Amino acid sequence: ADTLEGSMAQLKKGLESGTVLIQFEQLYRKKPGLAITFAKLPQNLDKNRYKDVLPYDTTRVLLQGNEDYINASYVNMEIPAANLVNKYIATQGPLPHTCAQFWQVVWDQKLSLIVMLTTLTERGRTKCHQYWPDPPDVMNHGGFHIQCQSEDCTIAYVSREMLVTNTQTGEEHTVTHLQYVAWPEHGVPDDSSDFLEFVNYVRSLRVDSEPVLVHSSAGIGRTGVLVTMETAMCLTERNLPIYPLDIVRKMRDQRAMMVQTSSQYKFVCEAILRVYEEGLVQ
Amino acid sequence: FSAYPSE
């Protein structure tokens, strides 16, 4: 409610005071009352990369005709005044034994865009399994063969085109894979301008009505920042009010803990203000 | 099984 102008006055003023950060610290991380059962079953415990980052039952991604569990959540951000919904699947970095289910989600829904917001390793520890092959190798995951047909590094991210072939049926599917490598776990992007350019590039690569698969290591911190920013960009361009706290709450009603740290929330709120101001015309 | 680290 209110207007874009008033919401940005409210955000700038509350950044200054700073009531914006206090209200973020007050927000629940996990919505009370939402069941989390499947994620804790004995056969599924080691399918979670982190013990405390689990999908709600209501928004858990199911594999079509397949009972295998995956730690993945549907996250949809509605902009109702624009009759717009931005769909995501937010998931963790696959483990060695969950690559099969990851690629099954991609196949089931013919997802043509994967956004990976992590390096494979940090400080000697593995943060994500390499679920694609180094070109020109071909990888087998759960009855999909994967090959990387193109790989180009920019400054901040790597752009890969991947071919997914179904071993059972012979069909093929192509996926664009963006790996943002300049953004450490529980941190902010190394460069804010690279981040914003990357978010707007992701927006431009959206296919109509198709979820973007977004993941990091846990799939909540850096993913939450990106989702918040894309939502805010859509709201700014449509002259609609932006309440970052409402956005984070809406995400957290669908996948717990989205936007991990106060620094990450402060970063995205400042970025939102920046975008609004440098786009503002008298 | 360990928690997602925080800073």
UniProtKB/Swiss-Prot annotation, chain A:
Protein's cellular compartments: Cell membrane; Cytoplasm, Cytoskeleton
Residue ranges occupied by any Tyrosine-protein phosphatase domain in the UniProt entry: 20-275
Active-site residue list: S216
Entry binding sites for substrate: E185, S216, S217, A218, G219, I220, G221, R222, Q260
Name the UniProt record assigns to this protein: Tyrosine-protein phosphatase non-receptor type 3
Functional note: May act at junctions between the membrane and the cytoskeleton. Possesses tyrosine phosphatase activity.
Similarity-based family: Belongs to the protein-tyrosine phosphatase family. Non-receptor class subfamily.
Protein origin, superkingdom: Eukaryota
Organism, scientific name: Homo sapiens (Human)
From Swiss-Prot, chain B:
Disease the record associates with this protein: A chromosomal aberration involving EPS15 is found in acute leukemias. Translocation t(1;11)(p32;q23) with KMT2A/MLL1. The result is a rogue activator protein.
Post-translational modification: Phosphorylation on Tyr-4 is involved in the internalization of EGFR. Not required for membrane translocation after EGF treatment or for targeting to coated pits, but essential for a subsequent step in EGFR endocytosis. Phosphorylated on serine upon DNA damage, probably by ATM or ATR.
Gene behind this protein: EPS15
Location of Phosphotyrosine modifications: Y4
Tissue expr: Ubiquitously expressed.
Disulfide bridge positions per record: none
Organism listed in the record: Homo sapiens
Domain notes for this protein: The EH domain interacts with Asn-Pro-Phe (NPF) motifs of target proteins.
Self-association state and partner proteins as the record states: Interacts with SGIP1. Interacts with HGS; the interaction bridges the interaction of STAM or STAM2 with EPS15. Isoform 2 interacts with HGS and AP2A2. Part of a complex at least composed of EPS15, HGS, and either STAM or STAM2. Binds AP2A2. Interacts with AP2B1; clathrin competes with EPS15. Binds STON2. Interacts (via its SH3-binding sites) with CRK. Interacts with SH3BP4/TTP. Interacts with ERBB2. Interacts with FCHO1. Interacts with FCHO2. Interacts (via EH domains) with DAB2. Interacts (via UIM repeats) with CORO7 (when ubiquitinated at 'Lys-472'). (Microbial infection) Interacts with vaccinia virus protein A36.
Protein name per the record: Epidermal growth factor receptor substrate 15
Function: Involved in cell growth regulation. May be involved in the regulation of mitogenic signals and control of cell proliferation. Involved in the internalization of ligand-inducible receptors of the receptor tyrosine kinase (RTK) type, in particular EGFR. Plays a role in the assembly of clathrin-coated pits (CCPs). Acts as a clathrin adapter required for post-Golgi trafficking. Seems to be involved in CCPs maturation including invagination or budding.
Residues of the full protein shown: 846 to 852 of 896
Protein's cellular compartments: Cytoplasm; Cell membrane; Membrane, Clathrin-coated pit
Domain of life: Eukaryota
